[PDB]
Subunit: 298 residues, 4 copies
């Protein structure tokens, strides 16, 4: 191309940050340059490309058509380059300003981050994490393209994917403290007589407990499905609904939500929280996997 030779490729970072942030202030912050230098860089990109690229519309900077068409190409270019350069020298935790991106849910964020970041805030003070909601627990392509470094969840692995287990726990049945129909653990029949709250973190049709019960031809009555366990626990606290939840979350919220926790009157295998990654993926990744060790999760 004759354009690559004329265009200051450093302006591509400006273009990419603004397309993602739609905001000059937060894009300039990501880039660690001043609002003024950012605005000047945008004027140059406008001149280099003979296009406005982004016009302010209230809050937001909105891309033109030419910008919209260029955006995936630039982000693909920067991904190839960044991966390229990461491989280049070994990972240095004390100096790293890298962001690790995890696909996660509220429960994995809750389980993982507080003890991980209690460490990282000291041993790696410039490393950042970014957790995102994903439409699936485990997208290989996202892991393969390096858009996402890790995925979190639990429970045979797709190809190119490995896991590192980092927490193991069990499910309990949760009800509010003064539930009218509990004077100990529900029986199977008593559990199946109530209405249930169910956590579906990827907007699945049934919960993990529903599918478990199906193996035995059992079905519960569902009052509410929601993606978030911590909110589910406050819901159980203010209603007569039962929630079958990770015990680690339920204990953390038992006093705040006013909850009682009970064994389930059917078997539920203990679960193990795991970190998924792509086999392709590397010093930064190994360092993070190694951090998941010294980790006492409560």
């Amino acid at each position: 191309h004759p354009l690559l030779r004329r265009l200051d490729l450093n302006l591509l970072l400006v273009f990419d940050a603004l397309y993602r942030h739609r905001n000059v202030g937060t894009a300039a912050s990501e880039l660690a340059i001043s609002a003024s230098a950012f605005s000047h860089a945008l004027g140059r990109l406008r001149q280099g490309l003979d296009d406005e690229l982004f016009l302010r519309q209230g809050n937001r900077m909105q891309p033109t058509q030419r910008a919209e068409h260029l955006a995936a190409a630039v982000a693909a270019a920067l991904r190839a380059l960044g991966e390229g350069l990461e491989e280049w020298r070994p990972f240095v935790p004390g100096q790293s300003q890298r962001t690790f991106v995890f696909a996660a849910t509220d429960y994995t964020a809750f389980a993982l981050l507080p003890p991980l970041m209690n460490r990282l805030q000291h041993s790696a003070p410039g490393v950042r994490l970014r957790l995102v909601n994903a439409e699936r627990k485990l997208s290989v392509e996202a892991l393969a393209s390096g858009r996402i470094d890790f995925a979190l969840g639990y429970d045979r692995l797709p190809e190119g994917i490995q896991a590192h287990d980092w927490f193991a726990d069990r499910y309990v049945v949760v009800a509010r403290r003064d539930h009218p129909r509990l004077a100990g653990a529900p029986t199977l029949e008593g559990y199946l007589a109530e209405r249930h709250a169910v956590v579906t973190p990827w907007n699945e049709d049934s919960g993990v407990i529903d599918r478990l019960l199906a193996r035995s031809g059992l079905r519960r009555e569902v009052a509410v499905q929601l993606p978030t366990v911590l909110a589910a626990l406050f819901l159980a606290g203010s209603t007569d609904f039962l929630l079958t939840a990770p015990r680690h979350a339920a204990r953390a919220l038992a006093e705040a939500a006013g909850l009682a926790l009970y064994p389930a009157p059917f078997d539920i295998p203990p679960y193990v929280l795991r970190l998924y990654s792509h086999v392709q993926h590397r010093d930064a990744h190994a360092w993070m996997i190694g951090q998941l060790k010294g980790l006492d999760i409560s």
Copy 2:
């Protein structure tokens, strides 16, 4: 081709009779006389050119063809009935309907406990399904009726899109949350003290910045971000195990202050108060007016 010749109303007659195996009881379910039923039966026998059910006294036994047909009919009638549920008159105390809400963990935490404390007794068969959506307000999903309502609040007086209506239900403010014993906080943070810490940031739709970063940028300010995540309730547990500051809804912060070990402070800069709203598409229903009315019971 043979479906168009068949009086499809007669399939209700087949279906009741296959289920009941007796004419008086099947007729009773359909609310017609036994005579009426017997005549419909004779019509169906002609329409399918089969005896369909063999009579022994008053026992009614399916022929081989009837048996083979029965699952097809039950499944068809199920599909029809499911598709017409949307036409069923809404009555609160009897409805078995689901309301689908696009939400975040925070609006789920804010809405569900009180709404369902009441709806569980007032409308014991109504279900709610909350989904993470890829943005706060997709007009198409709401126009579809693929989701019924969305929850969130208006940022910096954004204009409601094309044919969205909203109704306010909860006013609150943001506070600055730190772990209760923070190394550098002898008291409320100053602006400089706030900007000297790293921050936890809630990005409920995977945005690259938080609502507070964007507010700060409008004054030429920025904060050092250590973690972004979509969930406020986990974020408060994060603030409680680290030196990270979290600038969060006071309603969530108070409910977890003791569980997460937090201190709560006023922001050392101006933050508009926020109002949680319920958003919908302008295209009617008794169900929708009713849920809009239930969001008018505080906490």
Copy 3:
């Protein structure tokens, strides 16, 4: 109740209007007059207290409520349809069945003329509907029974997926085609002659490359592609008015050789002769009858 007050026959009117978006042709499919159809639609509008379809055309556009009912009604009629088809033994001289084939222009060209020449006499009531499908074999479609059969062949001795069977019905080979007066071919091209020209390529499922491209690559060769298009018969006329070479099935090329003005040559490289197959889900006498019909065909 729900079903109980509604005249369920009115759901066929609904279904036909939803598919035809045209009162006249929807009425025709149902073998009723326009007025009956309109009175029936009036009864549905009442029964459902909607308007269901909006005359914005001379075409009929669904409302939002019709929009939802539509898939339910479709599913109901499909279920009934299947059960009723099992009902009586298949009688070819009496049948009014539509057989639905996934096909390409080439397989339609190859199959339909000799098949229908016979069926128009031996099964005057039987109708065929050929559809362009997303790929040759999206087996879900064959199981759903959305499609009775699919035509095509198996490339590179490929195995074909589980629960799918197939029956040979045409053997043919590939041939290199050029306009008769091409300035540099009046006999078979050498490989270098072949690879010096530009090429038309048939990609029937909008694929990235042609079967001959994939073949050539296996030997580390590349041809220069001028035109990709999904239609063999149109590609033949393209080759007749240009200096492009097309590598295409001989049966099609012979048919168009005079009309398009083409010369036909063997390829300077090895192309395995292909077989046109009939594909079906193992899962029906209607199906076995069709299988028996291609069977004994020329």
Copy 4:
């Protein structure tokens, strides 16, 4: 990114040119920079990557093993950029290498490609075309994106254009009734009832439940008995030559196959508007040229 933020990315074109040429004089002339400018840039990149990157043997520049890992990443990145920036390449017909993507049917591919490519093979010899079977005639979505440059078809009577879609006419033609040359019941052109007493082949290019003629005929209270629907006119014309079925088809296509498939062509015994085939595009250089190409194009 955050190592990208640190690197002068423009130095990566010097890296990439030197990796391909393995000689500083030709890498430099590829980049249109002086020798000393090149050598300074290579010096900066060696400081930026803290590596030699290339060792000199004569004039031969041999990449360190490090440099080897990085070149593929640079090449991929530069390839993605160049492709997104093609949009900015000045359009020259005689030299252009672009691929135009059209949404089409077998009929419109047949009508357009022979004369279009008859010309373009000479006038724009590196220009390529890609025709795809789209799920409908006119998907404004695909046009906007520019995943598809153009769409081909005709307006049904006289259809209103969606917003952001413009159309340009390229061929006026009419429909005719086609039968096998020796049909047992046609002593000449069919009458209306003669036509309605046959079974019919019908072309439904987007898999619709009716033909454009069925729509038309129903508007006079008339219905035909359909034996076969298929999306291809050209296969349909052969079907008509091997059966008693009638087909109501574009004249341009039926004339091209009359001999090959053994057909007779007759005027329709009812009124059918002429059709006008058109080129559709979204309101948003290459596109302007292609639009002008069809303008004077001889189809017949």
